[PDB]
Structure 1
Amino acid sequence: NALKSDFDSLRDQITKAASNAKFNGVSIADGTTTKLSFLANSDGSAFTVTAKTL
């Protein structure tokens, strides 16, 4: 029972650590978006970065 309780506690801490991983309201790892695109040239070409849900 003590081991399963510690296991559930760590499983909740994983949820909280994944939830807090934002930078100014945007996150590449919390799973709210499929990808982020950043500027790569003056004409507006994207620099795609696929999201990795955690």
Structure 2
Amino acid sequence: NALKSDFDSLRDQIEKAATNAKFNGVSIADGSTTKLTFLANSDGSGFTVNAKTI
């Protein structure tokens, strides 16, 4: 039971650390979106970064 409680505490800490990783209201690792695209050139071309949920 003690090892199970340690396991559950570690799992809840992973869930908090995953949820909190945001900047400017968006996140690339929380799974809220599939990808983020940033400007890559003056014509409007983007630099896609695929989200990798953790």
Q: TM-score, normalised by structure 1?
A: 0.97
Task: Calculate the aligned-residue CA RMSD, in Å.
Answer: 0.4
CA distance in 2, matches of 1:24, 1:4: 36
Query: After TM superposition, what 4+ stretches of structure 1 lie above 4 angstroms from structure 2?
Result: none
Residue 25 of structure 2 corresponds to residue 3 of structure 1: no
CA deviation profile, 1:14-47 (whole Å, cap 9, x unmatched):
0000000000101000000000001010000010
Gaps of 5+ in 2: none
CA distance in 1, matches of 2:28, 2:38: 12
Q: TM-score, normalised by structure 2?
A: 0.97
Query: 2:13 is paired with a residue of what secondary structure?
Result: helix
CA distance in 2, matches of 1:24, 1:8: 30
Structure 1 vs Structure 2: percent identity of aligned residues?
87
CA distance in 2, matches of 1:18, 1:52: 11
One-letter amino acid of the structure 1 residue matched with residue 28 of structure 2: I
